[PDB]
Design a binder for this molecule. Structure first.
Ligand code: GTG
Length: 149
């Protein structure tokens, strides 16, 4: 499957990604939100590829579609996103992606979820990055979560 072939070292091509990307989006557009298994393989592919091959275009599309699915109750996309955040920022830290991470974590917790908040807590726990400027709201929620975890 392309989602596993494009992850191989030096095994990526826009020729293959264009085809793979279109089948996924079409099946999604055709079968509907959270109905395309091929679209879930694309969420997964983005979660790993963007770690060592960050592309702004891919990332903005990854985040947009993940939030769409999540707004209707399908969370695998948003789960893949928080995974890319938690592990991707641990390998290569980017301030602009770190702020997106905080924004989406706040949104996830305010929607009654804890998956995102655990992944952000996990990031602070393993990256050991100190003097991180954390949004005041997210500090309060992390406090509630440390009491939980
Ligand atoms: C070792 N480790 C653990 N955590 C965190 O701490 C908690 C431990 O419980 P846990 O590990 O038992 O998670 P689960 O309950 O099984 O479910 P779940 O956590 O949902 O599953 C773990 C997922 O991580 C994903 N994973 C492993 N490596 C990678 C990677 O390189 N890239 C991406 N995008 N995902 C990865 C994998 O797909 C898997 O579904 C979990 O929240 C862990 O995430 C870590 N977080 C960071 N930032 N870095 C780490 O090295 C790390």
């Amino acid at each position: 499957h392309p989602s596993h072939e494009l992850l191989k070292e030096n095994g990526f091509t826009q020729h293959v990604y264009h085809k793979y990307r279109r089948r996924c989006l079409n099946e999604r557009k055709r079968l509907g939100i959270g109905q395309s298994q091929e679209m879930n393989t694309l969420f997964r592919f983005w979660s790993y590829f963007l770690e060592d091959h960050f592309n702004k275009k891919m990332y903005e599309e990854f985040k947009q579609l993940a939030l769409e699915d999540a707004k209707e109750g399908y969370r695998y996309g948003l789960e893949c996103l928080f995974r890319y955040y938690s592990y991707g920022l641990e390998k290569k830290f980017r301030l602009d992606i770190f702020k997106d991470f905080q924004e989406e974590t706040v949104k996830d917790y305010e929607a009654g979820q804890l998956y995102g908040l655990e992944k952000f807590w996990a990031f602070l726990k393993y990256s050991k990055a100190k003097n991180l400027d954390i949004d005041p709201k997210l500090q309060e929620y992390l406090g509630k979560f440390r009491r939980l975890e």
